[PDB]
PDB file of C-alpha atoms and ligand atoms in Angstrom:
ATOM      1  CA  UNK A   1      -6.404 -17.063  25.769  1.00 51.06           C
ATOM      2  CA  UNK A   2      -9.500 -19.209  25.343  1.00 53.30           C
ATOM      3  CA  UNK A   3      -9.906 -22.959  24.914  1.00 53.96           C
ATOM      4  CA  UNK A   4     -12.308 -22.533  22.013  1.00 52.73           C
ATOM      5  CA  UNK A   5     -10.212 -19.974  20.078  1.00 51.80           C
ATOM      6  CA  UNK A   6      -8.800 -21.446  16.872  1.00 53.71           C
ATOM      7  CA  UNK A   7      -5.889 -19.036  16.755  1.00 51.94           C
ATOM      8  CA  UNK A   8      -5.022 -19.485  20.439  1.00 52.56           C
ATOM      9  CA  UNK A   9      -4.819 -23.244  19.835  1.00 51.90           C
ATOM     10  CA  UNK A  10      -2.613 -22.738  16.775  1.00 52.38           C
ATOM     11  CA  UNK A  11      -0.263 -20.418  18.657  1.00 49.65           C
ATOM     12  CA  UNK A  12       0.051 -23.097  21.359  1.00 49.06           C
ATOM     13  CA  UNK A  13       1.004 -25.709  18.732  1.00 45.15           C
ATOM     14  CA  UNK A  14       3.855 -23.514  17.486  1.00 47.92           C
ATOM     15  CA  UNK A  15       6.968 -23.532  19.656  1.00 46.94           C
ATOM     16  CA  UNK A  16       6.524 -21.040  22.489  1.00 44.80           C
ATOM     17  CA  UNK A  17       8.345 -17.710  22.296  1.00 46.75           C
ATOM     18  CA  UNK A  18       8.545 -17.651  26.100  1.00 50.67           C
ATOM     19  CA  UNK A  19       5.038 -16.252  26.501  1.00 49.22           C
ATOM     20  CA  UNK A  20       5.774 -12.668  25.419  1.00 50.77           C
ATOM     21  CA  UNK A  21       3.905 -10.315  23.121  1.00 48.21           C
ATOM     22  CA  UNK A  22       5.529 -10.130  19.663  1.00 48.54           C
ATOM     23  CA  UNK A  23       6.292  -6.746  18.185  1.00 46.77           C
ATOM     24  CA  UNK A  24       6.073  -8.131  14.652  1.00 46.31           C
ATOM     25  CA  UNK A  25       2.567  -8.261  13.130  1.00 46.59           C
ATOM     26  CA  UNK A  26       1.538 -11.883  13.389  1.00 43.24           C
ATOM     27  CA  UNK A  27      -1.450 -14.218  13.284  1.00 41.06           C
ATOM     28  CA  UNK A  28      -1.173 -16.894  15.985  1.00 39.67           C
ATOM     29  CA  UNK A  29       2.584 -16.331  15.830  1.00 40.07           C
ATOM     30  CA  UNK A  30       2.834 -16.781  12.058  1.00 39.18           C
ATOM     31  CA  UNK A  31       4.627 -13.942  10.254  1.00 44.22           C
ATOM     32  CA  UNK A  32       5.433 -15.152   6.733  1.00 45.64           C
ATOM     33  CA  UNK A  33       2.453 -14.717   4.420  1.00 46.22           C
ATOM     34  CA  UNK A  34       2.747 -18.376   3.401  1.00 44.21           C
ATOM     35  CA  UNK A  35       2.268 -19.389   7.047  1.00 46.20           C
ATOM     36  CA  UNK A  36      -0.547 -16.866   7.559  1.00 47.21           C
ATOM     37  CA  UNK A  37      -2.286 -18.131   4.424  1.00 46.63           C
ATOM     38  CA  UNK A  38      -2.132 -21.730   5.671  1.00 43.93           C
ATOM     39  CA  UNK A  39      -3.690 -20.746   9.013  1.00 43.48           C
ATOM     40  CA  UNK A  40      -6.454 -18.707   7.383  1.00 42.53           C
ATOM     41  CA  UNK A  41      -7.388 -21.540   5.020  1.00 43.81           C
ATOM     42  CA  UNK A  42      -7.438 -24.056   7.882  1.00 42.74           C
ATOM     43  CA  UNK A  43      -9.609 -21.690   9.926  1.00 43.25           C
ATOM     44  CA  UNK A  44     -12.174 -21.026   7.212  1.00 42.28           C
ATOM     45  CA  UNK A  45     -12.332 -24.630   5.990  1.00 43.85           C
ATOM     46  CA  UNK A  46     -12.461 -26.429   9.373  1.00 43.21           C
ATOM     47  CA  UNK A  47     -14.539 -24.005  11.493  1.00 38.90           C
ATOM     48  CA  UNK A  48     -18.117 -23.514  10.334  1.00 41.54           C
ATOM     49  CA  UNK A  49     -19.011 -20.982  13.068  1.00 41.57           C
ATOM     50  CA  UNK A  50     -16.104 -18.598  13.716  1.00 43.14           C
ATOM     51  CA  UNK A  51     -15.519 -17.277  17.244  1.00 40.74           C
ATOM     52  CA  UNK A  52     -15.687 -13.553  17.973  1.00 41.88           C
ATOM     53  CA  UNK A  53     -12.217 -13.577  19.517  1.00 40.69           C
ATOM     54  CA  UNK A  54     -10.700 -15.189  16.440  1.00 41.29           C
ATOM     55  CA  UNK A  55     -12.314 -12.616  14.152  1.00 40.59           C
ATOM     56  CA  UNK A  56     -10.907  -9.903  16.420  1.00 38.06           C
ATOM     57  CA  UNK A  57      -7.439 -11.499  16.286  1.00 38.81           C
ATOM     58  CA  UNK A  58      -7.594 -11.230  12.488  1.00 36.42           C
ATOM     59  CA  UNK A  59      -8.683  -7.578  12.708  1.00 33.31           C
ATOM     60  CA  UNK A  60      -5.843  -6.888  15.154  1.00 38.57           C
ATOM     61  CA  UNK A  61      -3.326  -8.589  12.856  1.00 43.95           C
ATOM     62  CA  UNK A  62      -4.525  -6.394   9.983  1.00 45.95           C
ATOM     63  CA  UNK A  63      -4.361  -3.250  12.099  1.00 46.13           C
ATOM     64  CA  UNK A  64      -0.849  -4.232  13.198  1.00 48.01           C
ATOM     65  CA  UNK A  65       0.091  -4.485   9.497  1.00 47.83           C
ATOM     66  CA  UNK A  66      -1.255  -0.961   8.977  1.00 49.06           C
ATOM     67  CA  UNK A  67       0.741   0.371  11.943  1.00 48.57           C
ATOM     68  CA  UNK A  68       3.840  -1.333  10.487  1.00 49.25           C
ATOM     69  CA  UNK A  69       3.191   0.371   7.095  1.00 48.09           C
ATOM     70  CA  UNK A  70       2.995  -3.107   5.565  1.00 45.15           C
ATOM     71  CA  UNK A  71       0.162  -2.380   3.170  1.00 46.48           C
ATOM     72  CA  UNK A  72       1.534  -4.901   0.659  1.00 47.65           C
ATOM     73  CA  UNK A  73       0.891  -7.711   3.133  1.00 49.06           C
ATOM     74  CA  UNK A  74      -2.441  -6.192   4.191  1.00 47.38           C
ATOM     75  CA  UNK A  75      -3.617  -6.298   0.567  1.00 48.61           C
ATOM     76  CA  UNK A  76      -2.586  -9.953   0.172  1.00 49.26           C
ATOM     77  CA  UNK A  77      -4.303 -10.975   3.418  1.00 47.84           C
ATOM     78  CA  UNK A  78      -7.540  -9.080   2.706  1.00 47.88           C
ATOM     79  CA  UNK A  79      -7.766 -10.454  -0.844  1.00 50.94           C
ATOM     80  CA  UNK A  80      -7.163 -14.019   0.368  1.00 50.77           C
ATOM     81  CA  UNK A  81      -9.838 -13.774   3.052  1.00 49.99           C
ATOM     82  CA  UNK A  82     -12.210 -12.150   0.563  1.00 50.42           C
ATOM     83  CA  UNK A  83     -11.798 -15.114  -1.791  1.00 47.67           C
ATOM     84  CA  UNK A  84     -12.296 -17.854   0.796  1.00 48.93           C
ATOM     85  CA  UNK A  85     -14.957 -16.180   2.950  1.00 52.07           C
ATOM     86  CA  UNK A  86     -17.158 -14.760   0.180  1.00 51.94           C
ATOM     87  CA  UNK A  87     -17.314 -18.137  -1.600  1.00 50.63           C
ATOM     88  CA  UNK A  88     -18.364 -19.967   1.573  1.00 48.83           C
ATOM     89  CA  UNK A  89     -21.709 -21.751   1.668  1.00 46.60           C
ATOM     90  CA  UNK A  90     -21.932 -20.644   5.326  1.00 47.21           C
ATOM     91  CA  UNK A  91     -23.574 -17.213   5.602  1.00 46.38           C
ATOM     92  CA  UNK A  92     -21.621 -16.443   8.782  1.00 42.52           C
ATOM     93  CA  UNK A  93     -18.352 -16.417   6.850  1.00 43.60           C
ATOM     94  CA  UNK A  94     -19.639 -13.761   4.466  1.00 45.51           C
ATOM     95  CA  UNK A  95     -20.719 -11.714   7.502  1.00 41.82           C
ATOM     96  CA  UNK A  96     -17.311 -12.226   9.111  1.00 43.47           C
ATOM     97  CA  UNK A  97     -15.578 -10.864   6.008  1.00 43.68           C
ATOM     98  CA  UNK A  98     -17.829  -7.793   5.961  1.00 42.55           C
ATOM     99  CA  UNK A  99     -17.001  -7.187   9.631  1.00 43.89           C
ATOM    100  CA  UNK A 100     -13.262  -7.626   9.116  1.00 44.75           C
ATOM    101  CA  UNK A 101     -13.188  -5.402   6.032  1.00 46.76           C
ATOM    102  CA  UNK A 102     -15.303  -2.669   7.625  1.00 45.27           C
ATOM    103  CA  UNK A 103     -13.107  -2.524  10.714  1.00 42.14           C
ATOM    104  CA  UNK A 104      -9.879  -2.584   8.709  1.00 43.30           C
ATOM    105  CA  UNK A 105     -11.091   0.195   6.407  1.00 42.57           C
ATOM    106  CA  UNK A 106     -12.007   2.413   9.378  1.00 43.63           C
ATOM    107  CA  UNK A 107      -8.516   1.936  10.815  1.00 44.81           C
ATOM    108  CA  UNK A 108      -6.856   2.615   7.447  1.00 39.94           C
ATOM    109  CA  UNK A 109      -8.947   5.729   6.833  1.00 39.51           C
ATOM    110  CA  UNK A 110      -8.246   7.171  10.270  1.00 37.73           C
ATOM    111  CA  UNK A 111      -4.543   6.278  10.214  1.00 37.77           C
ATOM    112  CA  UNK A 112      -4.287   8.185   6.919  1.00 37.35           C
ATOM    113  CA  UNK A 113      -6.894  10.780   7.864  1.00 36.32           C
ATOM    114  CA  UNK A 114      -4.577  13.645   6.934  1.00 33.97           C
ATOM    115  CA  UNK A 115      -3.556  12.018   3.624  1.00 37.14           C
ATOM    116  CA  UNK A 116      -6.617  10.307   2.116  1.00 36.48           C
ATOM    117  CA  UNK A 117     -10.163  11.404   1.367  1.00 35.33           C
ATOM    118  CA  UNK A 118     -12.549   8.471   1.028  1.00 35.56           C
ATOM    119  CA  UNK A 119     -14.904   9.090  -1.871  1.00 35.24           C
TER     120      UNK A 119
ATOM    121  CA  UNK B   1      16.932  17.573 -27.880  1.00 41.61           C
ATOM    122  CA  UNK B   2      16.159  14.729 -25.504  1.00 42.21           C
ATOM    123  CA  UNK B   3      14.014  13.984 -22.482  1.00 42.17           C
ATOM    124  CA  UNK B   4      15.489  15.255 -19.226  1.00 42.57           C
ATOM    125  CA  UNK B   5      14.967  11.937 -17.429  1.00 38.89           C
ATOM    126  CA  UNK B   6      16.087   9.908 -20.458  1.00 37.87           C
ATOM    127  CA  UNK B   7      19.419  11.739 -20.359  1.00 43.10           C
ATOM    128  CA  UNK B   8      19.792  10.878 -16.668  1.00 45.13           C
ATOM    129  CA  UNK B   9      18.969   7.220 -17.329  1.00 47.71           C
ATOM    130  CA  UNK B  10      21.316   6.956 -20.314  1.00 48.62           C
ATOM    131  CA  UNK B  11      24.138   8.605 -18.358  1.00 49.37           C
ATOM    132  CA  UNK B  12      23.580   6.095 -15.549  1.00 52.99           C
ATOM    133  CA  UNK B  13      23.773   3.132 -17.947  1.00 55.58           C
ATOM    134  CA  UNK B  14      27.024   4.426 -19.430  1.00 57.13           C
ATOM    135  CA  UNK B  15      28.394   4.301 -15.861  1.00 56.91           C
ATOM    136  CA  UNK B  16      27.150   0.774 -15.163  1.00 58.30           C
ATOM    137  CA  UNK B  17      23.882   1.635 -13.443  1.00 53.27           C
ATOM    138  CA  UNK B  18      20.681  -0.118 -14.466  1.00 55.66           C
ATOM    139  CA  UNK B  19      17.129   0.133 -13.144  1.00 54.51           C
ATOM    140  CA  UNK B  20      16.796  -0.266  -9.355  1.00 56.00           C
ATOM    141  CA  UNK B  21      14.419  -2.974  -8.213  1.00 55.45           C
ATOM    142  CA  UNK B  22      12.510  -0.448  -6.100  1.00 55.06           C
ATOM    143  CA  UNK B  23      10.212   2.235  -7.588  1.00 51.97           C
ATOM    144  CA  UNK B  24      12.492   4.961  -8.852  1.00 49.36           C
ATOM    145  CA  UNK B  25      12.630   8.092 -10.982  1.00 47.29           C
ATOM    146  CA  UNK B  26      15.518   7.626 -13.450  1.00 46.13           C
ATOM    147  CA  UNK B  27      17.408   5.657 -10.810  1.00 43.06           C
ATOM    148  CA  UNK B  28      16.609   7.857  -7.802  1.00 42.29           C
ATOM    149  CA  UNK B  29      15.021   5.762  -5.020  1.00 39.37           C
ATOM    150  CA  UNK B  30      15.478   7.562  -1.708  1.00 37.49           C
ATOM    151  CA  UNK B  31      13.296  10.641  -1.302  1.00 36.47           C
ATOM    152  CA  UNK B  32      16.465  12.718  -0.799  1.00 38.08           C
ATOM    153  CA  UNK B  33      17.670  11.773  -4.280  1.00 36.90           C
ATOM    154  CA  UNK B  34      14.200  12.100  -5.863  1.00 40.71           C
ATOM    155  CA  UNK B  35      13.939  15.639  -4.446  1.00 41.99           C
ATOM    156  CA  UNK B  36      17.301  16.640  -5.903  1.00 39.60           C
ATOM    157  CA  UNK B  37      16.334  15.313  -9.337  1.00 38.10           C
ATOM    158  CA  UNK B  38      12.868  16.901  -9.316  1.00 34.82           C
ATOM    159  CA  UNK B  39      14.320  20.245  -8.231  1.00 38.08           C
ATOM    160  CA  UNK B  40      16.875  20.178 -11.061  1.00 38.89           C
ATOM    161  CA  UNK B  41      14.115  19.363 -13.570  1.00 36.40           C
ATOM    162  CA  UNK B  42      11.590  21.966 -12.425  1.00 36.73           C
ATOM    163  CA  UNK B  43      14.046  24.823 -11.827  1.00 36.59           C
ATOM    164  CA  UNK B  44      16.073  24.465 -15.063  1.00 35.99           C
ATOM    165  CA  UNK B  45      13.330  23.554 -17.585  1.00 36.80           C
ATOM    166  CA  UNK B  46      10.729  26.247 -18.264  1.00 38.87           C
ATOM    167  CA  UNK B  47       8.660  24.217 -20.770  1.00 39.90           C
ATOM    168  CA  UNK B  48       8.517  20.608 -19.531  1.00 38.43           C
ATOM    169  CA  UNK B  49       8.482  17.866 -22.127  1.00 39.39           C
ATOM    170  CA  UNK B  50       5.538  15.485 -22.287  1.00 40.01           C
ATOM    171  CA  UNK B  51       7.925  12.525 -22.155  1.00 42.55           C
ATOM    172  CA  UNK B  52       9.258  13.717 -18.787  1.00 40.83           C
ATOM    173  CA  UNK B  53       5.814  14.472 -17.361  1.00 43.84           C
ATOM    174  CA  UNK B  54       4.756  10.922 -18.309  1.00 47.15           C
ATOM    175  CA  UNK B  55       7.850   9.411 -16.665  1.00 45.28           C
ATOM    176  CA  UNK B  56       6.854  11.211 -13.451  1.00 46.41           C
ATOM    177  CA  UNK B  57       3.295   9.894 -13.759  1.00 46.25           C
ATOM    178  CA  UNK B  58       4.737   6.396 -14.256  1.00 46.48           C
ATOM    179  CA  UNK B  59       6.930   6.794 -11.170  1.00 44.68           C
ATOM    180  CA  UNK B  60       3.928   7.849  -9.078  1.00 48.32           C
ATOM    181  CA  UNK B  61       1.918   4.924 -10.449  1.00 47.44           C
ATOM    182  CA  UNK B  62       4.800   2.574  -9.546  1.00 44.45           C
ATOM    183  CA  UNK B  63       4.549   3.920  -5.995  1.00 45.77           C
ATOM    184  CA  UNK B  64       0.790   3.243  -5.994  1.00 42.07           C
ATOM    185  CA  UNK B  65       1.326  -0.327  -7.225  1.00 42.55           C
ATOM    186  CA  UNK B  66       3.873  -0.805  -4.397  1.00 44.12           C
ATOM    187  CA  UNK B  67       1.351   0.681  -1.900  1.00 44.32           C
ATOM    188  CA  UNK B  68       4.021   3.207  -0.832  1.00 45.38           C
ATOM    189  CA  UNK B  69       1.495   5.800   0.264  1.00 48.27           C
ATOM    190  CA  UNK B  70       3.948   7.747   2.430  1.00 47.10           C
ATOM    191  CA  UNK B  71       6.398   8.286  -0.424  1.00 48.18           C
ATOM    192  CA  UNK B  72       3.644   9.052  -2.940  1.00 52.62           C
ATOM    193  CA  UNK B  73       2.296  11.792  -0.668  1.00 52.53           C
ATOM    194  CA  UNK B  74       5.790  13.241  -0.111  1.00 50.55           C
ATOM    195  CA  UNK B  75       6.532  13.281  -3.840  1.00 48.64           C
ATOM    196  CA  UNK B  76       3.172  14.792  -4.850  1.00 51.25           C
ATOM    197  CA  UNK B  77       3.462  17.546  -2.234  1.00 52.09           C
ATOM    198  CA  UNK B  78       7.081  18.320  -3.144  1.00 52.73           C
ATOM    199  CA  UNK B  79       6.196  18.672  -6.825  1.00 55.35           C
ATOM    200  CA  UNK B  80       3.190  20.826  -5.927  1.00 55.60           C
ATOM    201  CA  UNK B  81       5.257  23.414  -4.069  1.00 52.72           C
ATOM    202  CA  UNK B  82       7.966  23.620  -6.756  1.00 56.24           C
ATOM    203  CA  UNK B  83       5.592  23.614  -9.751  1.00 57.16           C
ATOM    204  CA  UNK B  84       3.115  26.157  -8.406  1.00 55.91           C
ATOM    205  CA  UNK B  85       5.750  28.698  -7.310  1.00 58.08           C
ATOM    206  CA  UNK B  86       2.522  28.981 -16.112  1.00 53.65           C
ATOM    207  CA  UNK B  87       2.765  25.633 -17.893  1.00 48.71           C
ATOM    208  CA  UNK B  88       4.230  24.099 -14.721  1.00 49.63           C
ATOM    209  CA  UNK B  89       0.931  24.772 -12.982  1.00 51.64           C
ATOM    210  CA  UNK B  90      -0.869  22.841 -15.724  1.00 56.89           C
ATOM    211  CA  UNK B  91       1.731  20.072 -15.580  1.00 57.07           C
ATOM    212  CA  UNK B  92       1.115  19.610 -11.865  1.00 59.76           C
ATOM    213  CA  UNK B  93      -2.661  19.416 -12.375  1.00 59.41           C
ATOM    214  CA  UNK B  94      -2.135  16.814 -15.115  1.00 60.25           C
ATOM    215  CA  UNK B  95       0.153  14.654 -12.965  1.00 58.55           C
ATOM    216  CA  UNK B  96      -2.134  14.868  -9.937  1.00 57.62           C
ATOM    217  CA  UNK B  97      -5.283  14.151 -11.972  1.00 57.54           C
ATOM    218  CA  UNK B  98      -3.757  10.958 -13.377  1.00 55.88           C
ATOM    219  CA  UNK B  99      -2.742   9.836  -9.867  1.00 57.48           C
ATOM    220  CA  UNK B 100      -6.183  10.655  -8.433  1.00 55.54           C
ATOM    221  CA  UNK B 101      -7.939   8.600 -11.125  1.00 56.38           C
ATOM    222  CA  UNK B 102      -5.752   5.566 -10.405  1.00 57.82           C
ATOM    223  CA  UNK B 103      -6.345   5.923  -6.660  1.00 57.64           C
ATOM    224  CA  UNK B 104     -10.104   6.318  -7.052  1.00 56.62           C
ATOM    225  CA  UNK B 105     -10.395   3.304  -9.341  1.00 57.85           C
ATOM    226  CA  UNK B 106      -8.065   1.107  -7.273  1.00 54.76           C
ATOM    227  CA  UNK B 107      -9.070   2.056  -3.724  1.00 51.66           C
ATOM    228  CA  UNK B 108     -12.062   4.424  -3.686  1.00 46.38           C
ATOM    229  CA  UNK B 109     -10.047   7.276  -2.171  1.00 47.86           C
ATOM    230  CA  UNK B 110      -7.966  10.233  -3.345  1.00 45.67           C
ATOM    231  CA  UNK B 111      -5.151  12.347  -1.923  1.00 45.15           C
ATOM    232  CA  UNK B 112      -6.114  15.376   0.157  1.00 47.34           C
ATOM    233  CA  UNK B 113      -2.773  17.074  -0.691  1.00 43.49           C
ATOM    234  CA  UNK B 114      -3.122  19.440   2.268  1.00 43.33           C
TER     235      UNK B 114
HETATM  236  C1  EQ7 C   1     -11.242   3.000   3.367  1.00 42.81           C
HETATM  237  C2  EQ7 C   1      -9.822   2.938   2.812  1.00 42.81           C
HETATM  238  C3  EQ7 C   1      -9.032   4.150   3.311  1.00 42.81           C
HETATM  239  C4  EQ7 C   1      -9.894   2.932   1.284  1.00 42.81           C
HETATM  240  C5  EQ7 C   1      -8.493   2.835   0.692  1.00 42.81           C
HETATM  241  O1  EQ7 C   1      -8.030   3.819   0.219  1.00 42.81           O
HETATM  242  C6  EQ7 C   1      -7.653   1.560   0.776  1.00 42.81           C
HETATM  243  C7  EQ7 C   1      -6.211   1.653   0.446  1.00 42.81           C
HETATM  244  N1  EQ7 C   1      -5.660   2.916   0.029  1.00 42.81           N
HETATM  245  C8  EQ7 C   1      -4.297   3.083  -0.412  1.00 42.81           C
HETATM  246  C9  EQ7 C   1      -3.224   2.235  -0.194  1.00 42.81           C
HETATM  247  C10 EQ7 C   1      -1.977   2.503  -0.745  1.00 42.81           C
HETATM  248  C11 EQ7 C   1      -1.846   3.622  -1.549  1.00 42.81           C
HETATM  249 CL1  EQ7 C   1      -0.301   4.030  -2.306  1.00 42.81          CL
HETATM  250  C12 EQ7 C   1      -2.907   4.445  -1.807  1.00 42.81           C
HETATM  251  C13 EQ7 C   1      -4.132   4.167  -1.254  1.00 42.81           C
HETATM  252 CL2  EQ7 C   1      -5.494   5.231  -1.598  1.00 42.81          CL
HETATM  253  N2  EQ7 C   1      -5.343   0.518   0.533  1.00 42.81           N
HETATM  254  C14 EQ7 C   1      -5.873  -0.804   0.970  1.00 42.81           C
HETATM  255  C15 EQ7 C   1      -4.952  -1.845   1.011  1.00 42.81           C
HETATM  256 CL3  EQ7 C   1      -3.274  -1.543   0.531  1.00 42.81          CL
HETATM  257  C16 EQ7 C   1      -5.359  -3.111   1.421  1.00 42.81           C
HETATM  258  C17 EQ7 C   1      -6.718  -3.280   1.765  1.00 42.81           C
HETATM  259  C18 EQ7 C   1      -7.644  -2.224   1.716  1.00 42.81           C
HETATM  260  N3  EQ7 C   1      -9.013  -2.502   2.099  1.00 42.81           N
HETATM  261  O2  EQ7 C   1      -9.292  -2.561   3.234  1.00 42.81           O
HETATM  262  O3  EQ7 C   1      -9.831  -2.684   1.271  1.00 42.81           O
HETATM  263  C19 EQ7 C   1      -7.231  -0.939   1.302  1.00 42.81           C
HETATM  264  C20 EQ7 C   1      -8.184   0.251   1.220  1.00 42.81           C
HETATM  265  O4  EQ7 C   1      -9.328   0.125   1.500  1.00 42.81           O
END
């Protein structure tokens, strides 16, 4: 973990699971969409310059949702980030959303490479 | 004369069975039960009714709205191999085309069906 990572700090404020990797898709230990939504809003509204490692933790959470076949939650999370990041007055948040979406769509397309043809 | 799937649904209601919460075709939820129903429909009816074709389109669209891509692909491919083995060939193309339009407009992708 890193001192300056928003999501590492949030995970350390939650009660510790013992220090083990969770199997469940999670963002800083949060699993319920209501808890994930709260963390995402706090991140985007309190951090004006998001850290690379935090952006990658969001990508990894989304790719974990894909691997869990939880596309319903993936859609909710992507739409919520789209709303908050694309409306930001900070250009870096729009760039972060583009990066997250691009990486998630590559993972989705490859995971379903035998099923889906991207137009 | 009555829709094949309407008869199934009405028979279910007379036995105390109402719509499942999960996407379903006339009450069938698990792929094993959906297969059995689709096979009965396609093998016993030589001239499928529009009303039944549209209930299958609606079931597939319910799967899309639920993001159940795995089950949508299974159902589309199962129908393909029963309906192409005539008007059933046209019915399959009609069902698939409706699904592909919804997928393209919602997500920018379509089924490969390979
Ligand atoms: C590039 C990618 C392969 C294009 C696509 O196809 C996408 C997709 N497809 C899909 C899902 C369920 C079913 Cl039933 C059928 C289909 Cl086609 N689902 C998403 C969801 Cl659920 C959330 C977020 C995104 N996202 O990242 O924008 C997508 C997405 O792109």
